[PDB]
Amino acid sequence: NTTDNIDYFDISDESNYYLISQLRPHFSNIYFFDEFKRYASYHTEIKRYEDIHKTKVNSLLNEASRAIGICNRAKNTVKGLINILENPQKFKTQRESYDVKLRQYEEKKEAFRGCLLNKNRKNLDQIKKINNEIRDLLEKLKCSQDCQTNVYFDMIKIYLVDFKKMPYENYDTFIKQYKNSYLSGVDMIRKIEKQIDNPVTINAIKFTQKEMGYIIDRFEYHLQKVKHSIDQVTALSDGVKPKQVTKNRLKEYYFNIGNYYSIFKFGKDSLNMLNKALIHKEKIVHNLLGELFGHLE
Amino acid sequence: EIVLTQSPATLSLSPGDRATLSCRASQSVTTFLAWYQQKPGQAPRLLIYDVSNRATGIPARFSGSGSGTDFTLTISSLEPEDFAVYYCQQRSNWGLTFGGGTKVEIKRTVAAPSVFIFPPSDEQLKSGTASVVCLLNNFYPREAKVQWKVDNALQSGNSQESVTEQDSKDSTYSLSSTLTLSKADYEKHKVYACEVTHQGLSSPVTKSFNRGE
Amino acid sequence: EVQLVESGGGLVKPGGSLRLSCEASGFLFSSYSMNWVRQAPGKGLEWVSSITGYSSEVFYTDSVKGRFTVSRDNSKNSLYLQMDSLRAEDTAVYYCARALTIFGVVITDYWFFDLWGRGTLVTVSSASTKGPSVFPLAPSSKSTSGGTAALGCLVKDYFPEPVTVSWNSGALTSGVHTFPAVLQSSGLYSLSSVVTVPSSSLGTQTYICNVNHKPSNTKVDKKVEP
Numbered sequence: 136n137t138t139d140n141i142d143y144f145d146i147s148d149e150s151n152y153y154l155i156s157q158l159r160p161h162f163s164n165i166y167f168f169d170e171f172k173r174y175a176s177y178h179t180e181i182k183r184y185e186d187i188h189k190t191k192v193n194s195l196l197n198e199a200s201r202a203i204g205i206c207n208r209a210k211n212t213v214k215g216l217i218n219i220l221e222n223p224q225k226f227k228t229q230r231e232s233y234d235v236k237l238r239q240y241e242e243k244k245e246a247f248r249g250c251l252l253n254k255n256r257k258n259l260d261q262i263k264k265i266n267n268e269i270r271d272l273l274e275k276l277k278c279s280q281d282c283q284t285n286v287y288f289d290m291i292k293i294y295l296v297d298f299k300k301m302p303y304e305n306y307d308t309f310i311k312q313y314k315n316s317y318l319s320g321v322d323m324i325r326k327i328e329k330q331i332d333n334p335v336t337i338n339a340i341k342f343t344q345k346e347m348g349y350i351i352d353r354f355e356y357h358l359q360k361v362k363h364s365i366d367q368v369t370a371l372s373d374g375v376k377p378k379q380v381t382k383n384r385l386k387e388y389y390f391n392i393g394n395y396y397s398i399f400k401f402g403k404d405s406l407n408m409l410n411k412a413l414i415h416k417e418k419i420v421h422n423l424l425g426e427l428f429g430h431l432e
Numbered sequence: 433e434i435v436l437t438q439s440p441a442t443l444s445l446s447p448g449d450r451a452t453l454s455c456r457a458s459q460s461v462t463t464f465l466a467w468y469q470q471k472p473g474q475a476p477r478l479l480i481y482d483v484s485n486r487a488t489g490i491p492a493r494f495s496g497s498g499s500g501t502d503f504t505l506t507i508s509s510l511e512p513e514d515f516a517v518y519y520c521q522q523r524s525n526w527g528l529t530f531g532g533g534t535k536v537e538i539k540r541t542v543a544a545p546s547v548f549i550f551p552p553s554d555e556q557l558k559s560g561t562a563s564v565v566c567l568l569n570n571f572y573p574r575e576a577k578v579q580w581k582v583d584n585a586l587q588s589g590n591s592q593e594s595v596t597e598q599d600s601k602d603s604t605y606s607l608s609s610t611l612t613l614s615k616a617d618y619e620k621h622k623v624y625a626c627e628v629t630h631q632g633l634s635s636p637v638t639k640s641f642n643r644g645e
Numbered sequence: 646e647v648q649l650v651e652s653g654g655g656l657v658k659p660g661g662s663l664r665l666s667c668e669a670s671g672f673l674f675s676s677y678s679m680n681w682v683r684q685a686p687g688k689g690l691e692w693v694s695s696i697t698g699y700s701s702e703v704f705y706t707d708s709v710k711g712r713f714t715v716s717r718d719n720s721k722n723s724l725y726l727q728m729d730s731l732r733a734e735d736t737a738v739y740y741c742a743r744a745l746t747i748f749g750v751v752i753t754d755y756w757f758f759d760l761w762g763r764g765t766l767v768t769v770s771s772a773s774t775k776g777p778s779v780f781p782l783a784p785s786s787k788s789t790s791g792g793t794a795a796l797g798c799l800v801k802d803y804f805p806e807p808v809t810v811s812w813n814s815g816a817l818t819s820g821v822h823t824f825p826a827v828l829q830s831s832g833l834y835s836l837s838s839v840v841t842v843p844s845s846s847l848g849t850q851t852y853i854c855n856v857n858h859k860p861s862n863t864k865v866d867k868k869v870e871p
Contacts, residue, residue: 150676152752164751260678260701263746266753274462394750433707466757468690475761476682476690481745487759519690523756526704528692546841548795550782556801565782567795567839569822594824594836608824608837610799639788 136222136419141214143350143412145405146248153259155251158404161199162255164262166397168192170290171269174389177286180275191268195261202254209247216240220342221419223335233338273386282385284378287392291372294396298365301403303358306410310354313413317347320420336423343423347416354409361402364395434459436520436531444539444573451507455520455531460500464524467496467505470533471516472597479518480505510536515598537574538603544632545571545606549625549639552618562618564611566626566639570604578609579627581638587611619643647671647760649741654765656774656805656860661731663767667724667741675699675719678744678754681726683737684764686806687825693739694726695756708734731769740764768805772832776861777803779854781869782837789844796847796869797839798854802831803861810838811855847871 142157155161168188175184216239219226229236276282321344328337371392380388435458445451455465467480478487483503484496493514495506507514515538520531546569552562568576574595580587593609609626625640652666667679681693694705696715703715714727724741743760747753782797789795800808810823817840826836838854854867 149673150752152748167751256675256699257701260697260699263698263752263754264702266751267755270753271462271464390750464755466755468758470690475740475764476758477761478745478757478759481755481757487745521690521692521757527706528695528756530690530692533689546790546793546795548788548790548839550788550797553780553783553799556778556780556799559778561801563780563799563801565797565799565837567797567837569795569839569841592827592829592835594827596822596824606822606824608797608822608839610827610835610837612829641787 136422137218137225138214138221138415138419140412140415141210141217142408143353144244144248144251145353146252148252148256148259150259153255153262154401155203155255156401156405157203157251158408159200160196161203162195162258162262163397163401164266165192165196165199166400167393168195168265168269170393170396171389174286174290174393175272177289178276180277181272184272191265195258195265198261199255199258202258203251205254206247206250209243209250213240213243213247216243217342217346221339223339223423226335226339233334237342270386270390273389274382276382276385278382278385280381281379282382284376284380284385284388287385287388288372288376290392290396291368294368294392294399295365295372297396298368298399301361301399303362303365306354306358306406309410310351310358310413313417314351314355317344317351317417320344320424321348331427333427336427340420340423340427343416343420347413347420350409350413350416354406354413357402357406357409360398361406364399364402368392368395433527434461434522434525434529436522436529438518438520438531438534441532441534443534443536445510445536446539447512448509451510451514451536453505453518453534453536455498455503455505457501457503457522459525461522461524463499464522465498465503466521466523467494468519468521469514469516470519476519537598540572540603542632543570543572543602543604545569545576545628545630547626547628547637547639549641551624551641551643557615557618560615562613562615564613564624564626566609566611566628568607568609568628568630570599570602570606571630571632572604573631574598574605575631576607577629577636578607579629579636580609580611581625581627581640582613583621583623584625649743649760649762651739651741651762651765654739654767656768656770657731658771659732659769661769662727662729663731665726665728665739665741665765665767667726667762669722669724669741669743674717674722676752677746678756679717679724680742680744680758681715681724682740682742682758682761683735683767684740685734685737688737691737695744696724728767731767733769735769736767738764738766766806770805770832772804774861775802775804775833776863777801777808777856777858777865779856779865779867781854781867782839783869784842784847784871786844786871792844793841794844794847795839795841796852796871797837798856798867798869799835799837800826800856801835802829802833803835803858804833805860806834808834808836809857810836812838812840813851813853814855817852 147154172188175181437456463483468476469479470476480496493508497504517533517535519533548567550565580591591611596606622643627638629636650668678697680695683693694715696703712730716725741762742758745755745757745759777800780799784794784796820841823838824836826834856865
């Protein structure tokens with residue numbers, strides 16, 4: 136009944152365009168930049184990226200991990216604060232109320248989440264800059280209204296092979312069952328907390344249920360986005376396939392399927408983390424529920 | 433610095449015509465060029481970004497074309513509102529540079545200026561300076577030559593002139609030339625004339641006055 | 646409402662310093678890059694400097710490199726320009742401009758300007774603030790045209806810009822041509838405001854020349870009698 140990893144916490148900025156994760160590469164835009172270096176492979180006019188793209192994105196990623204590493208002192212502050220609210224035995228050692236200690240969790244949690252953003256603010260402009268350098272680089276293609284779609288649909292074929300490698304329904308019925316068994320106990324404690332006069336364990340259960348909710352909606356959020364990614368590129372394969380498009384439409388294309396794939400890789404990374412986090416939180420509530428029903432004397 | 437030349441420096445067309453302005457660059461700027469519009473007493477207004485993309489809210493009559501060094505802004509059929517100055521600007525290389533800008537103006541019938549000359553006031557000469565003012569009133573086109581003669585001696589180097597914006601009611605410009613000489617130099621000579629030349633005049637008219645007369 | 650409001654303009658001697666502000670409202674200030682564009686009187690647009698959304702990078706034109714500095718406070722939705730060691734050629738109207746950013750599948754922007762402010766005037770000259778002296782450019786029966794007579798009002802030697810000249814406190818507006826000022830060799834400004842009137846009206850109707858110079862706090866009313 137102790138949480139050793141709090142990587143499930145995340146925050147997006149006021150743009151709602153940048154979602155910061157504790158897992159590498161912290162920005163889904165990094166995966167999109169990796170996919171563009173595979174786009175410049177097939178085009179002879181912009182093969183210079185393979186040298187200029189790697190030197191640019193690698194420093195953005197290295198600064199992204201540097202930014203999140205600064206908040207480690209604040210990361211451990213709430214990692215040790217939820218270990219007190221989760222464990223009644225560890226809570227019975229300190230000498231402060233549950234509400235007074237719960238406000239320390241909330242205040243220091245926002246400090247940790249807010250730190251992840253403030254340290255990455257100057258990186259938010261660096262992503263916009265590389266996006267521009269990617270768009271302007273595509274202007275060097277020796278086409279105007281005759282740009283070739285061959286490489287555009289080659290990546291579509293490869294992406295749907297990579298997307299079937301993940302079992303979507305395995306994640307879908309997992310969270311549906313865990314959410315059904317989550318609200319079960321939420322609507323349950325509220326109906327039995329008055330029969331058993333025990334405030335130490337039930338307060339710890341409601342808190343571990345509060346974080347269980349947050350982790351769940353983070354799972355359903357990333358689950359939809361990888362579902363939306365898979366459905367959209369599938370329709371691109373089942374849709375019209377012209378041989379020639381304007382140079383601006385091709386830039387729309389690479390940015391479309393490039394972002395579609397980065398959301399898939401970013402979601403699949405956090406979905407597996409949230410899975411291991413949900414089961415760990417559920418193991419805590421299950422055993423502190425057994426202590427509530429195991430001592431009827 | 434990547435300079436942007438915009439010749440023709442000015443266009444004189446009428447509503448319904450087609451204005452096709454140019455902007456040429458020293459170095460090549462690919463297709464990273466923008467077009468702005470500025471009216472007197474107002475801020476510039478973004479018209480087109482990256483050669484051919486129209487900004488939001490601006491009418492469809494504004495078109496964009498060009499690549500490399502030679503670029504073109506096209507207004508299909510001009511409207512009374514479209515008459516202003518148009519600047520081009522590049523974002524390719526640092527040291528962001530603008531073009532010289534070219535003003536489009538309303539073309540009307542040639543109108544001759546009403547010319548007037550004012551002797552310096554007696555209160556001004558009571559201090560040390562002397563200003564003779566020549567006013568060219570409501571003429572078109574703007575191109576006008578204002579020659580200052582003092583005792584039929586061609587003057588140069590002591591004149592200053594200022595011109596108005598094209599009027600919103602009659603589409604006419606107006607000039608005010610101010611020849612400011614010394615008080616000692618003013619009392620030395622007697623006859624002061626303002627010789628103007630305009631396309632609306634058969635021959636250069638002259639307005640003159642004799643000192644103290 | 647979406648707007649940019651500049652502030653802090655004024656007048657200083659060569660080598661002095663001023664700080665211009667710009668308060669944005671109506672949009673999320675942090676997501677946009679910001680710029681400064683200046684326009685000399687009667688001249689064209691010149692880009693001064695630029696700053697990114699979160700002050701990650703800043704850039705300057707060569708003429709102000711080492712003399713100016715740009716800073717932004719996204720908490721106060723404010724853009725700043727610190728102008729140190731000013732020169733004569735720095736006299737211009739400075740504009741606050743917003744960088745054109747696009748919100749599609751990703752955020753991207755151009756180094757163009759989609760939003761502008763009204764701008765403020767910055768004048769750098771060793772000349773001191775001086776009130777305008779106004780002289781009547783009186784009409785005469787010899788200089789009259791067919792049926793029109795021209796009378797004016799020369800606003801001579803003032804500093805700095807601008808002046809406002811009206812006739813009969815606003816009752817006379819038609820036929821009026823207030824001309825742009827010229828910067829004399831003396832460093833002082835000077836202009837003339839004329840009006841074309843019927844020649845028959847000279848002996849009966851009065852013409853009052855109202856000038857207002859706010860920097861020097863002077864207001865002059867010169868009656869121009871023939």
